[PDB]
Amino acid sequence: PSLLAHPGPLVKSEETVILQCWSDVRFEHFLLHREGKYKDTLHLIGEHHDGVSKANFSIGPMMQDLAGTYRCYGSVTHSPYQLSAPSDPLDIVITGLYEKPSLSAQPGPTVLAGESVTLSCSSRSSYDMYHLSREGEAHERRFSAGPKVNGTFQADFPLGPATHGGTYRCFGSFRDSPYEWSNSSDPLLVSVT
């Protein structure tokens, strides 16, 4: 069973996101499970169309307790449901809780293919961790304040040789609450020619 967030895993406080469970395997039920100290499971009757089974879970107005790692399971029995193998884990985080950092490009937003571009994320408020996100991509990059316990005001993300353009966003977070992030910085569209 596969699991993906719509429109994505970064969820603004109090908004809602949809986590969709789907498989080729015709499951009558789908159980969306959240790990952690707020572990829980949601259940939805499956739906089959072009030979595929899927369920859309609406993750209620985003709240801190709803953030964390999720996994779903297909099932074909009646409660207690006999569960299939879990999907790959998917982290969901709540954003919009702290002052957005500033995001900028060293060469600049417009660069030549093959030339190096570096993004800097900064803030007058210290963050223990900075996150660099690119629209359309799952992997995120991180920069830690490290062992030091008083956060850091800046994070540089060298992207290396420009290859394809993209829209970037960065966020700050604290060590004691890793799934809770700041408001997004203004998006930075990078163009390569």
From Swiss-Prot:
Gene Ontology BP terms: immune response; immune response-regulating signaling pathway; stimulatory killer cell immunoglobulin-like receptor signaling pathway
Keyword hit for Transcription regulation: no
Keywords from the UniProt entry: Cell membrane, Disulfide bond, Glycoprotein, Immunoglobulin domain, Membrane, Receptor, Repeat, Signal, Transmembrane, Transmembrane helix
Glycosylation-annotated residues: N56, N150, N183
Paired cysteines (S-S): C21-C72, C121-C170
GO cellular component, one term: plasma membrane
Residues of the Ig-like C2-type domain: 14-79, 114-177
One example GO MF annotation: transmembrane signaling receptor activity
Regions of this protein lying in the Extracellular compartment: 1-193
Chain's role: Receptor on natural killer (NK) cells for HLA-C alleles. Does not inhibit the activity of NK cells.
Family to which this protein belongs: Belongs to the immunoglobulin superfamily.
Protein name (record): Killer cell immunoglobulin-like receptor 2DS2
Span covered, complete protein: 29 to 221 of 304
